[model samples]
Target: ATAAEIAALPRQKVELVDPPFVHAHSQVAEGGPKVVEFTMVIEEKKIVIDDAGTEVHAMAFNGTVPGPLMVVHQDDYLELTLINPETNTLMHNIDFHAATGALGGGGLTEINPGEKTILRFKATKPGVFVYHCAPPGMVPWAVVSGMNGAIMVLPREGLHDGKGKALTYDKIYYVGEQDFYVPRDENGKYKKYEAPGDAYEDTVKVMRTLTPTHVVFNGAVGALTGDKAMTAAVGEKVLIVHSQANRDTRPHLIGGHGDYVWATGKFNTPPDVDQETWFIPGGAAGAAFYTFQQPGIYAYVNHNLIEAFELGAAAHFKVTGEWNDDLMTSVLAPSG
Candidate 1:
């Protein structure tokens, strides 16, 4: 699809969105080929802190978590326009590794508040890439505050081709981090509208301490791996994109053991074998592919294990399908 066609298509208004967001395959349109046009609004809002707390200001993309994931084929073209309608004193730009330039599709264009910038690029690789604000020191803050995401470049040969297809999975998920200063409510939920002074300073401290208040998957902590976790069909392959921000850490143990793991953030080559835990360091990303040969609830967590519980960063995988006493099934229940 061309840029004009995408512009003519219906547009969706995305609000309160942050960065590092991702959109799975199903979220895209169904057709031989299609184009999607996204108009994102960046805003700077006040975060109020109670009497005893500090107030912090944050720069958010679209006012939500992890912004939105832009999906395209290796051969398709993508056009993204960013508008900063808020009155702010900072400048912003987007850098994408999947594009010709490792930074913001190579445009490296920066715009101030009330200004607008356009970035256009083609999905040249069949792998997941990171896109975020490329304003030097601002990246950590922007990424953590929601300026990051996964760009999925479908293989040129289509899904059936196994060249870059690591494993066949029924579902895909994105993981990232979020830092908050305010305390949670009695039910352990973020107290929105309550902004704390020095929240950004505290976030910096937390970054140093490696103790994030809100550890999340796909925007907020436990989004996909939480109570409302994504499901899969038994014997079906599952694809997971593990991306972290600010700090270096691994996704660890996600759903027991991943049969194939692309240790690198970009899935451009073959994956490692029988990876029960993936070591995704800070500033880096990885992919884990596996199949639910059995029917059960699988838990995806950071192998730091303790962080999984302490930060409440855990997700479940429910699989449903008929079970037979053949092939691998006999190994677990053999001659009982």
Candidate 2:
């Protein structure tokens, strides 16, 4: 169907929907070109206030964390649908960094609960871009609840071809942090539901007094731990785009360190090398990685140290297969 016709369709319920999570390298089909369609649910509910004295669960895109990843090539057309379920209260919209305008590809419609809005846009850039709700103050709230993700526009030169190989990498991953106040028992299990007085905020002062009980990776803290985390092969170059949405925090650190760190999000220039840790300030973006030489679990955590432990923000890397000889002898040596 035409893009306009698809967009004019009636809105549907924004129920729990899982996005297709696939690596960029695996998104190709045999056809000349293809259309990538993405859909997400937006809803509102009560969540414990972080230090803000009032219970609040701001509107969120998608039922889970970080919404959905919209990956497309520089020329591919993307069909995006924002579905608002009956539980939400405010109008929602999406703004993409790559769009000609910051208000997303959607024209001017404010999608409400139980309604749907469709937007079509061609990917025109070859880098990482952020997408989030653009409804006034909703940007911060939407972002905090995982309403953002990277839109990677592959160079038109085709996959892995040196013509656009400048954007190519042995591996690619996205990381971001989320801070939210949720009702918790003394033991710290998140309470299923929250009440009005459960949280409080100083509206006049515009200050938050709630403590974030959970810190997470990707979506929820520790969601990528163990088998759920991403892994890389030995000597393979890894590209990680690190982003911090709501809070100003350090980038998540991998114990071994990154072989190269592009402090800037783009790889057009040379990057700093042999960096143990990189910093991705709030609202900023960058890339970092390490070349694995040994097969083992690499612990990934926010370098904030204390916050890492309190929020349980950590994950593991399970590197298997053969180890490279040049980088293996050191670990193979006897303990001295």
Candidate 3:
């Protein structure tokens, strides 16, 4: 629809919830102009990747990778407080993909170390958007350091089918896809830096290679497996909102399918149906909705096999209860 057409539609405010690393807002309520507030902090730290002290220097928001997910309705007021504590080693800023004009508020929200800044914008668009720190020479490093995040501007009428009937989710999962480049020592060990800026030149070298040393969900490889994987019941509808802040991704759910895929992560238009795998290109997000028909473990991965396993782009879903035999059954023991 045209911007003028969308502007003619009515909009409302959305509610808040604890940020789930693997889920998003399952639903939004009906209302008018509401106030939404958010506070985020910056931290520079080290973390292990494959095993032991396989470390990399990382800059993060709210002390976590991918930052915190933000949600609102199309017309609500979004007020934000971004803080760069004295503990931080570099200046920072935010550029929201969801906002209009003024470089998506990137200029107005710059905060040096030990400083804080506040900015506000109207949620005029109904879609999933990416927000990141874009300090000119620093965007590539900033985004790769986990300075990017996602926001959802829900339609006031709530989620719907292509036919316009309302659809609901039992849960919402937020997945942030991150790619990292860690410089190495002469001995082939990954190098760690004391400050965010110290790793700049070397990290950029790897960034330019377009080959990520690590690609992960919600910060790391093991972030969404075993104890951390998303959970659901035998029969609950789930909406997975996935953001790939730096690169393209094709997400596929093993043993499941997307009943409705907003391939561009926007709600202003209708979604495609029954997709085996949905594509999300560079610097964007795509949302997928599915329901578990049987109980078991399911793997959600980037369709790029090497990236999914070798480079680490995989997550799991653990469902409990009875399994439906109609979906599958033991067939051939002779092959084993």
Candidate 4:
């Protein structure tokens, strides 16, 4: 259909929210399919990735690392207006793993600085998927530098279990895992660059090593820890949409288990029940379901201990409620 023809369909504009929080939307389809439209502006800025004050010139959608999580019912039309401002120094585009054609919209949506373009695709599948900047020659560098996000194309009737029973969550959190490759000088200290363009070449050299200097949640080492931890109450079902646009990841909750998990992100497939850890492949996203049972700090981390601790791929959840002593009790304390 032509742009006008598609625009004539029922239109709904959405305002996106940053990671670890999803915008409000009905879990089940309220009406017939409509055009779900979103506008995102390209952002190029330097971001500090760790407590060490290490900074990297990052690229993002809507001025945030990993962009924002979007939700729409199945069969809806997803229309995006992408803008690359004159202030940015490079060209930008988006590739939607959820969309079907034109290299996932990357081919048709390349916009130079000071330009904007619209790309529309039908939400044909029901699943969670990753979207990222995939410019002609700068794919890896762009993704690792934070130009990525995830989208949830839910089934019209909403999520269901293996037995076809309805499953819903009290809250949704988006965790975007980012792997950065920042070059360091001979003195073994991370180098600093003035601008993204100035850092591109050196960044690519580090990327070639296939070893990231940092692997973080929501763009930084402590972005999702301590006071910034996500929250939930006991017995509230929570759905976590995890995306790793560049490398594979394993998401595990310290004090929780995945009651149901779509490890591949497809709601059409029956979800695995009672998963201790779920895998999210590179270039894709996965959804995990859990209900907090006790009140405490839950450390959500990559199962790869090194990445979760040494490289920064970890987050925290501050869950509140009464604890169930039946589930676990202290049999003994240290006698020292």
Best by lDDT: 4
Give the lowest summed-lDDT range of ten residues in model 4.
1-10
Query: How accurate locally is residue 291 in candidate 2, as Cα lDDT from 0 to 100?
Result: 62
Model 4, 27-106: lDDT tens per residue? 99888889999999999998999988999888999888889998999999999999999999999999999999899999
Which one wins by TM-score: 1 or 4? 4
Candidate 2: tens digits of C-alpha lDDT, residues 181-214: 5545567544443532233332211324435656
Location of the lowest summed lDDT over 10 successive residues in candidate 1: 12-21
Candidate 1 Cα errors over 4 Å, as ranges: 1-36, 43-59, 87-90, 105-107, 159-168, 178-198, 210-214, 225-227, 252-255, 322-336
Q: What is the C-alpha lDDT of each candidate?
A: 0.59, 0.58, 0.81, 0.92
Ranking by TM-score: 4, 3, 2, 1
Q: Which scores better on lDDT, 2 or 3?
A: 3
Model 3 earns a TM-score of 0.91
At residue 21, what lDDT does model 4 achieve?
87
**lDDT score at residue 206, model 2, on the 0-100 scale:** 30
Candidate 1, residues 243-266: lDDT per residue as tens digits? 654555566544357677777755
Candidate 2, residue 315: how far the Cα is off, in Å: 1.9
Q: Over the stretch 148-199, how does candidate 3's per-residue lDDT look in tens digits?
A: 8888888877888889888788888888888888887789778877766678
Stretches off by above 4 angstroms in model 2 are 1-35, 43-60, 105-109, 158-171, 182-213, 267-271, 322-336
